[PDB]
Amino acid sequence: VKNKCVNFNFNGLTGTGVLTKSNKKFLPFQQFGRDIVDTTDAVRDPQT
């Protein structure tokens, strides 16, 4: 479910927030996202 505050457990990564589509350029080996503050920003969907 996207655009709605939910609890996610993406591949064991637990957390809460809102998810949606993106226009990133995740390299094929990339799996996570972050910022200069080292906070999980983007998660690649395991089944999508």
């Binding site: 990133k24 390299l27 972050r34």
Partner: peptide, 24 residues
């Protein structure tokens, strides 16, 4: 056979340490 001539490396041989996307 083979040789063992030595050269310089310059800025080369840097790999993505993790699989965490980052930008700017």
């Amino acid at each position: 056979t083979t040789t063992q001539s030595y050269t310089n490396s310059f800025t080369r041989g840097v790999y993505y340490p993790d699989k965490v996307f980052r930008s700017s």
